[PDB]
Amino acid sequence: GAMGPLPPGWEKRTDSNGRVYFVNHNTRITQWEDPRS
């Protein structure tokens, strides 16, 4: 695993319920699709 770190701005975050999402700091967008694919 560990296909690299998140692209400048992204991060692998967890929500209140237990899902893993990807947060973009730049746009402040909460996306669910994995950028490190």
Curated annotation (Swiss-Prot):
On T-cell activation, phosphorylation by the JNK cascade on serine and threonine residues surrounding the PRR domain accelerates the ubiquitination and degradation of JUN and JUNB. The increased ITCH catalytic activity due to phosphorylation by JNK1 may occur due to a conformational change disrupting the interaction between the PRR/WW motifs domain and the HECT domain and, thus exposing the HECT domain. Phosphorylation by FYN reduces interaction with JUNB and negatively controls JUN ubiquitination and degradation. Monoubiquitinated. Autopolyubiquitinated with 'Lys-63' linkages which does not lead to protein degradation. Detected in uterus (at protein level). Widely expressed. It is found in: Cell membrane; Cytoplasm; Nucleus; Early endosome membrane. The modification Phosphoserine is found at residue 16. Acts as an E3 ubiquitin-protein ligase which accepts ubiquitin from an E2 ubiquitin-conjugating enzyme in the form of a thioester and then directly transfers the ubiquitin to targeted substrates. It catalyzes 'Lys-29'-, 'Lys-48'- and 'Lys-63'-linked ubiquitin conjugation. Involved in the control of inflammatory signaling pathways. Is an essential component of a ubiquitin-editing protein complex, comprising also TNFAIP3, TAX1BP1 and RNF11, that ensures the transient nature of inflammatory signaling pathways. Promotes the association of the complex after TNF stimulation. It comes from the Eukaryota. The WW domains mediate interaction with PPxY motif-containing proteins. Monomer. Part of a ternary complex composed of SMAD3, ITCH/AIP4 and NEDD9/HEF1; within the complex NEDD9/HEF1 interacts (via N-terminus) with ITCH/AIP4 (via WW domains); the complex mediates ubiquitination and proteasomal degradation of NEDD9/HEF1. Interacts (via WW domains) with OCNL. Interacts (via WW domains) with NOTCH1. Interacts (via WW domains) JUN. Interacts with JUNB; the interaction promotes ITCH-mediated ubiquitination and degradation of JUNB. The lineage of its organism: Eukaryota, Metazoa, Chordata, Craniata, Vertebrata. Residues 4-37 form the WW domain. It is linked to Defects in Itch are the cause of the itchy phenotype which is an inflammatory and immunological condition characterized by inflammation in the lung and stomach, hyperplasia in lymphoid and hematopoietic cells and constant itching in the skin. This is E3 ubiquitin-protein ligase Itchy.
